[PDB]
Amino acid sequence: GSWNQKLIANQFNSAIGKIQDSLSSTASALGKLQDVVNQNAQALNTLVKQSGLV
């Protein structure tokens, strides 16, 4: 078998690992962002409860 081909199969794992790591960081970042929306939405709701139609 070609030496390059042999390297490529091993290589495929490296790319996948880097991709997952890259994606992995972003997911956490997105999760943090979701919390930030919750606080803003929650604050308005809390205000509405104190004084609002419903």
Closest by CA position to 49, among listed 25, 41, 18, 28: 41
Residue type, 54: V
User: What determination technique applies here?
Assistant: NMR
Secondary structure, 3-state, the chain: CCHHHHHHHHHHHHHHHHHHHHHHHHHHHHHHHHHHHHHHHHHHHHHHHHCCCC
- Listed in sequence order, the residues at least 6 apart from 33 whose beta carbon sits closer than 8 Å to its beta carbon are none
For 44, half-sphere exposure in the C-beta direction (CA atoms, 13 angstrom radius) is: 4
- The Cα–Cα gap between 31 and 2 comes to 44
- Listed in sequence order, the residues at least 6 apart from 37 whose beta carbon sits closer than 8 Å to its beta carbon are none
- The Cα–Cα gap between 39 and 32 comes to 11
Structure tokens of 4?
A: 């390059």
